[PDB]
Structure formats: C-alpha cells, structure tokens
RNA sequence: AUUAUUGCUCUUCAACGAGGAAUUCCUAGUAAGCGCAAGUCAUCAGCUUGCGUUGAUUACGUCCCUGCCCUUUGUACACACC
RNA sequence: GGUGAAAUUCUUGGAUUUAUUGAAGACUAACUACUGCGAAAGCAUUUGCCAAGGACGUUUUCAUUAAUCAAGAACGAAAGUUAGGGGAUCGAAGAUGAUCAGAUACCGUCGUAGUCUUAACCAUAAACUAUGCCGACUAGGGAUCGGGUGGUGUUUUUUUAAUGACCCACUCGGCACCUUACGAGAAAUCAAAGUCUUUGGGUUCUGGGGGGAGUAUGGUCGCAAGGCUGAAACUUAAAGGAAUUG
RNA sequence: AUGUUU
RNA sequence: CGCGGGGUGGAGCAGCCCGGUAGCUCGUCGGGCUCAUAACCCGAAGGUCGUCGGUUCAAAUCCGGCCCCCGCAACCA
C-alpha cells in the first residue's frame, strides 16, 4: 500500500452536482516543489494534512 | 416584423443554398441557416486520460482527437440549448461567448 | 511480448457491442452486447451494462489467450448520427481496466461524401 | 382554415364543379 | 458445449519485406480439415497495421498500411503491400477552416504489372506576415496545382513497383517533391500522400514475391 | 354515565422481532427524550398554545430535486390561459 | 432493431455484429465563409471538349446608336403529367405497432407513385432583400472578392531582373458590414426606405376598409392537374401595421 | 409522454 | 386406422430431454411519485401442470389409457 501525505495550501473553491466536494491545491510534503489539484469532500480550509493513496491523478471540475 | 437585421440565416447574393439535414432531428435545413458547431472532444477523456495510458502499450501514447461537425435546425439547437433566446439589443452580438 | 487483438467498439445509440477479434478481423472472439449483460431493453446503451458486457469479453479474450487489443471504436455512422454512444466510453474504461493492454485508440465511424439521403424527411422527427 | 387548406379545398369544390358541369350539357 | 476456440491453429504474420519488421502478430483459424483446408481459409485475410509499429518511430502514427496474406510457409504468413489510408484523426486534424484544401487523385499501373488508384492531399498555408486571416488560392492555382500534383505522382509511379513506391512514400520524398514543384505556386504547406489503393492483382509470381 | 364521560383494583395477555416504494421537520440551548401550566371544562388528552429540565449528529454550502423572485424572450391574451 | 417508454419486425434456416469482395442507383460531406458567378430559377469530385459572360486596362474604333418598357417572347425551384430507361436511399398514398377518451396524426416498421435521366409539357413558390430599372448627389470607417498602378517593401530563385504568395498605399467594380445619422419614417428601422407640403431627373407596373374572392362567369393556354384575365349580388365597423405596459 | 372546453 | 405434435394462474409461454420443486409477459387489486393520469417503483390474489392408473429417496416432468385440437398417410365386410 503506497503511502504519501500531503497538506491544502489553497482552498480552490465549493464543487459537486449538489455542491458538497472542496477542490484543493495540494502541496506534498516528500518532493514539496509540486502543486496538484485534488478533490475533497469533508470541510476543509488552509493548512490541513490529507491523505492520498494514488499519487498521479489529478481531480479537474466535477460535471 | 424583420426580427433579424438580415435574416434568420446568412444568405445575400445567392438566393439558393444547397440544404443540410438536422444532425439531432433530420429536419431539412439552408446550409447557412443550420447552428453549425464544430466538436473537437477527444476520442477518450472519459475521466480516464490515466487509465487509458497506464493500459497502453505505447509510450508517450499522444491519444488521438476526434472532430465532429454538428448542424442543428434552430429548434433543436434551442431545445439542446446549443443557442438561448437573447435579448433585442444582445442578438446584434456576432461574436461567440 | 503480447499478442494483438481488435476491439472493435460499435457503441450506438440504444446499444453498445463489443466484438473483439483477431487482427484479421474475420475470425471473431466473445462478440458480447449490452442486451447480453441487461434485461430492459432501455439501458442496452448504459454505461453500466457497456462495461459489464466489456468485462466479459475481457474475460473471455484472458481465457482465449490475447493480451493487447489495438482498439477500433465507431458510432453509427451512416447516415444517422456520426457520433459515439454513450456507452462506448464505459466500454473502454472495462477493457482497460480489466487487465488488457490498449493501443492505438482509433474512430473508425462511418462518414458519407453525401449519401443515402436522411431518414426523416425535410421536416425531421416532430417530438 | 389556413389559407392553403382552403385554396385546396376550393380548388376540390372547382373540380367538382367541373364535373357536374361536364355532366351537364 | 463446443468451445471453438478449442480447435484452432495460431499463425505468426511475416508480414514485410521492407518496413522495418518481419513480424507484425498473430492470428487464430480452424484446423484444416477434409474439404478445408487452412491455407484455404486463409490467403484472403488481410491485416491492419500502424506505421509507426512498422517503423518503430510513432512519427508514423497516422499512414495505417493493409497487408494480406499470400502463402504460408510453416505458420508464417507471407503478405505482400496491400494499400495506404491515412486515419480518420489525422485527416480531420489536418482539414480547417479559413483555408483550400486541394486533393488529386490518379489511376495508374506501375511498372510490372500493379494498378494502383493514388489519392495526393494539401491544404494551402498562411504566410509569414499575411494579415488576411483565410489565405485562399484563386483555384486556377489550384487547378494548376492539381495538374502538377498529378504529373509528379504518375512520373513517380509507373518505374516503380511496390517495394520502390514504398521506398520513396516512406521518406515522404514526394511530398517534398510536391511541394518543391508547387511553391512557386501556392505556398500550400501540408502535402501529403493521403492514400493509395490496389486495384487488380497480377498472377501470384512467389519468384519475386519472395523477396525476404 | 347505557352506546363503558372519567378515575381505581384484579384478571386470558393480541399484533409489533425496527419497518416497502416513498415521505415529513430541523442548523445550537437548536432536534430529539421528558413532563409541567393554561385553553377547550361540571368531567375526560394522546390535542394545541407557552414553559423548563437532559440535551447530541452533521453542515457553515449548492441550484441536481421542488417551489419562488428577477431579467430576457414570444403572444393573434387585455374580461388578461377559467 | 427501434423508443421517452414500448411494440410491429429479423433471430440456434445463425439474426444483430466482424472481415474479403461485387452489383445498383443517388449525392458530392469535411474545405463551406456574413465568400463567388449567373437575368432569375439556380450553380460545390477530377479532366477534356464546346461556345458564352461581368469587372479591370486602353491616347483603339462607331458616334446618340440610349433608358424604361403595354402587346408580344426565352428561361423559369419543388410538386404534377406523357412515353422510355433506371429504380439504391428517402418516401404523398397504402398497410401495420403503441399512446389516446377517439388518433385513419405527431412517434416506430414495411412500402407504391414520386425522388434520377432522356424527349416533351406544366409556368406555379414566404419565385423575398416581402424593397422596380436607369442617372446624379448627400457622412465616416474597416474588412472581403476580382482587376490595374507603385514600393530602398517581406517571402519564393533562375542567373541581374521577373511573374507566384504576402504587406502597405491607392483606384475601379461587387457581395455585404459597423457607427452616426443632417435626413426619412407610425415605428421597427433605413445610406437608402435620404436629397418630399421648401412637394417635378426619365420611365414601367401595382393598390384604394375587411370579407364574399382570387370566387362565379366569359375568353385564352395546358393531356390533365391547373395557369393568365377576372366580377357582382350580399355582408360587416372595424380588419390591419409598428411599438408599450401587464 | 399525456391532461379536453368555460 | 397408423405415425408424430400440442393442452401449464383470468389470457399467452419457458420449465419437461433424465425430481430440491410451479414461475415469466399482459390484465386484476393496494400503496407510492405527480396538480392528475401514463410510463415507473414496491407489495398483494392467482393454477397446483387436460383427465385417470402406474413407475418413482420425495414426479407436471419420464410410462401406459382416455377427452380435445392439429398435420400427413391407408381403406374388399
Ligand atoms: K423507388
Ligand atoms: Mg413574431
Ligand atoms: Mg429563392
Ligand atoms: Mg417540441
Ligand atoms: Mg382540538
Ligand atoms: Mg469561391
Ligand atoms: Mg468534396
Ligand atoms: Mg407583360
Ligand atoms: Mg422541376
Ligand atoms: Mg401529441
Ligand atoms: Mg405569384
Ligand atoms: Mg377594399
Ligand atoms: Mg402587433
Ligand atoms: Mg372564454
Ligand atoms: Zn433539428
């Protein structure tokens, strides 16, 4: 099982057919130069620590 | 009255242009008159660029892109809401949003 | 390294088939259909009955022996729609998900040089 | 009664009258 | 209850003599029987390959090639060049708007005995400080364009067999050719070879035909 | 006081093993659990109106569902889509 | 298969689907545009042949030979008609399946005439830009098409130079376009629908409230369907155009 | 998908 | 008279070809969505397999008769 954690830098904004998931700027923290855009569901904002068992999918708009 | 400065379609100097059939209906349309879109969708996104790569077997795959021109009749294009009714002044406003 | 095969999506609309077969293409392998994996007669084209009919004929081509398909997905085409049904995309999602190996993706619909005048009539379906 | 449907009716109701007259002599 | 697939005979297509590669894959066929036999079954099915999995380079994605099956020789199946069509992505990536496409097209027999039907493609180009935003031609530029097209492609064929024709379409020597003989027409950058066809086949003749 | 007004005592202890498609209320002393006071009264609560006590979960948003508002648009409606 | 959902229907005579071919007829995608030609209807695969055409350039020729035009003629979308050919697809009719309260419709399947062509009719369309043609003038602007003129031009080379493409400056003619409108109109809108009560450049046609009615009748043309010309009795206070508010 | 009039 | 086929909820069918045991499509009834039907979702009623005998660890299923329907084929009292 791959493991990797990383943190939201930068809440993007409210997304979902009824509006429920937060799109985030992820900052990794192995290898940190690298923002990816992800997509979660429970309430975040700003420095707040996810984990991500993928490592490359990168989550765009939910339509 | 004349609803549009012009016409409904884009015909001055011709009289006659060969017709095109509505891709969603089949209703027989003025080549001119018909909603013409062009889609340029790729062949697979399918949420699934990554899936598709990782399951190929050629490296740095560049998947193709498929082109599609798209001729809708006015109701259609209407109904499928490729066009809305706009306002007096905002349908002298040729250029695409 | 693998063998190859064709996948030959023909994903219209009200139906999706999945007919992989050699790189001929005369001799057939596990010609599955949406209908096949759904009993409606609506959700023939479904996404879900697209990849469950593609899951089987992944299946059946793992037991046949090929291991990579160079995909061939087509709509109608004809005179009809020129565009892929919804299904076809659920299609390929099972076979590559299904431990096949994919290549060279390909649209091999049917487009006309302006025949076979539209089935309809000039004033189109009245719906 | 758009006024197609009633120039075709019209035009029904002259062949009739055409009829009726040729019959007529 | 029967399970087909049970009975059936693999072959490896040696399809090339020229390409970069022998091999392009397998294919599966019933046992020879009785009153059928395998190579019977076979000797008509035709294969569709990509260049780019012929040449090894994916600078030739586009320019699928069919081969059929000849003889076979010890499950090797011998083809010989069947026929060129560009695909339906590259095509419809390289036709636009806001500029003429040109096509030519010409039937001719090459210099055994090979007919084939050639179908040449462009699309004219914009130049470097042209404002005007389609850069059409004045299609006496194309008429003449297309005249030219076609005399560079019948000097081409007709000292060329198969081997050569595909010799030279491989480097795309005669869409530089083209466009070296119409520049001083029409800039018209995107030549190409679109397809080429077979049109009847000569007596089978494996004296030549084995050529690996 | 029978067609038990009601209250109390004893006595066979019935379905219900957590609920079907669906559907209702609700964002902090709030929902829920609980009873109390009043109203209806000569009497009778499971009702309603107010109250307090124990007191969470999740969310801190969206227009996909429903309804509404505004703008645009069409009308041959103006008693105005009955 | 088909649909929103169905069903008629094909289907262990292997239907749908895959591959190699062939036959038939139709059509000419994508390039295709606020772009071209034509008197209009119309005209979009290559090549050859056949004649024709507008614009441009002109220090060529004639010299009023011109403009509009009743009567009169040529062409004239589609549909329809006649006789052959052809008949793939679509498909008035017709037959069937479902919904409906009825559905002899919309939707689905099959399918005749027709759809194509030759030789003859037919001469009608929202045949529209609902805007006659010729001529002069009255704002500005930018693209675009064809031609001509010039560049210390860019690019293409053949070897000076040159056509080709491109840019700039025009200029002629054309399809249009955007702003502003002195101006016009009832307004919508209009560079013509302006140069109109301060009303006359020339000329052809059409209309006089709405129905009856593009009807009856007469004539004429057509094989027919019908086309052209074309009333009256009677009846009615409104019909209609543009725009505004709900 | 359909919902007829006053 | 012979050879074969068929009879299964109210109507139409698979099930049978070697017993785990009666269901499927439509109508019918109830609730649900809808402003209301339709489509649709979830429930509920339905025969006991044409009628008898026999075989069968427990038979509609296989066997032997009878009633009905069907096709073909033959006819010295
Ligand atoms: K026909
Ligand atoms: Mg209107
Ligand atoms: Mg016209
Ligand atoms: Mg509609
Ligand atoms: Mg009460
Ligand atoms: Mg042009
Ligand atoms: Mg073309
Ligand atoms: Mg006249
Ligand atoms: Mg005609
Ligand atoms: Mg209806
Ligand atoms: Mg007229
Ligand atoms: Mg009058
Ligand atoms: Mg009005
Ligand atoms: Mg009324
Ligand atoms: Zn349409």
């Known amino acids: 099982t791959p493991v990797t954690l990383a943190k939201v830098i930068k809440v993007l904004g409210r997304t979902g057919s009824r509006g429920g998931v937060t799109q985030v700027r992820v900052e990794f923290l192995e290898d940190t130069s690298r923002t990816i855009v992800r997509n979660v569901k429970g309430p975040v904002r700003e420095n707040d620590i996810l984990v991500l068992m993928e490592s490359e999918r990168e989550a765009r708009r939910l339509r | ?97 | 390294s693998q063998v190859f095969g064709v996948a030959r999506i023909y994903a219209s609309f009200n139906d999706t088939f999945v007919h992989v077969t050699d790189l001929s293409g005369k001799e057939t392998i596990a010609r599955v259909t949406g209908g096949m994996k759904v009993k409606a007669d609506r959700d023939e084209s479904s996404p879900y009955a697209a990849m469950l009919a593609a899951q089987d004929v992944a299946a059946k081509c793992k037991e046949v022996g090929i291991t990579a398909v160079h995909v061939k997905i087509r709509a109608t085409g004809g005179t009809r729609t020129k565009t892929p049904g919804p299904g076809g995309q659920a299609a390929l999602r099972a076979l590559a998900r299904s431990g096949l190996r994919i290549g060279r993706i390909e649209d091999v619909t049917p487009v006309p040089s302006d025949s076979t005048r539209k089935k309809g009539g000039r004033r189109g379906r009245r719906l | 009664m758009r006024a197609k449907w009633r120039k075709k009716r019209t035009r029904r109701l002259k062949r009739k009258r055409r009829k009726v007259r040729a019959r007529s002599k | 209850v029967v399970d087909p697939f049970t009975r059936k005979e693999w072959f490896d297509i040696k399809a090339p003599s020229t390409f970069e590669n022998r091999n392009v894959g397998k294919t599966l066929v019933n046992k020879s029987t009785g009153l059928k036999s395998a190579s019977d079954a076979l000797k008509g099915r035709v294969v569709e390959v990509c260049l780019a999995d012929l040449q090894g380079s994916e600078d030739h994605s586009f320019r699928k090639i069919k081969l059929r099956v000849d003889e076979v020789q010890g499950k090797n199946l011998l083809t010989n060049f069947h026929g060129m069509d560009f695909t339906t992505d590259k095509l419809r990536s390289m036709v636009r708007k806001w500029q003429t496409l040109i096509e030519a097209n010409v039937t001719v027999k090459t210099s055994d005995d090979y007919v084939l039907r050639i179908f040449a493609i462009a699309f004219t180009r914009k130049q470097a400080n042209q404002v005007k935003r389609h850069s059409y031609a004045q299609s006496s530029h194309i008429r003449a364009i297309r005249k030219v097209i076609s005399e560079i492609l019948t000097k081409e064929v007709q000292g060329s067999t198969l081997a050569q024709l595909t010799s030279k379409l491989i480097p795309e020597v005669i869409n530089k050719e083209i466009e070296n003989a119409t520049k001083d027409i029409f800039p018209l950058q995107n030549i190409h070879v679109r397809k080429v066809k077979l049109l009847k086949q000569p007596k089978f003749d494996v004296g030549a035909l084995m050529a690996l």
């Open chain 2, 1 to 97: 009255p004349k609803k549009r400065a012009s016409n409904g379609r884009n015909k001055k100097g011709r009289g006659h242009v060969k017709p095109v059939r509505c891709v969603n209906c089949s209703k027989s349309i003025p080549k001119d008159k018909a909603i013409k879109r062009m889609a340029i969708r790729n062949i697979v996104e399918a949420a699934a660029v990554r899936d598709l790569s990782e399951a190929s077997v050629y490296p740095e795959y560049a998947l193709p892109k498929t082109y599609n021109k798209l001729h809708y009749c006015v109701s259609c294009a209407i109904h499928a809401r490729i066009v809305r009714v706009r306002s007096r002044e905002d349908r002298k406003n040729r250029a695409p949003p």
